[PDB]
Design a protein around this nucleic acid. Structure first.
Length: 72
DNA sequence: CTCTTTGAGAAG
DNA sequence: CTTCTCAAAGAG
């Protein structure tokens, strides 16, 4: 049994973005999708990323509450 | 397990 | 400081 690390702003946005591409292109390797996702993320605005940062924070603050002695 | 991304948080 | 692991994803 293990408690996972909460998702960072990239990993929150990437989860839907990845699957949006995968649903069209199911034969594209997930290693290759990351490289596309990594490029796209570094082309987004502060406003575009903000919701994912706000959520990434929320996820982390929540997880710090739930797991106050989490070994990383 | 890897392969790849960013980014947190820890280690050296 | 750098440098490492893991979160997600799922096919090799």
């Amino acid at each position: 049994p293990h408690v996972k690390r909460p998702m960072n702003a990239f990993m929150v946005w990437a989860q839907a973005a990845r699957r949006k591409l995968a649903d069209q292109y199911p034969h594209l390797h997930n290693a290759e999708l990351s490289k596309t996702l990594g490029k796209l993320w570094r082309l987004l605005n502060e406003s575009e990323k903000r919701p994912f940062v706000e959520e990434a924070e929320r996820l982390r603050v929540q997880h710090k509450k739930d797991h106050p002695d989490y070994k990383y």
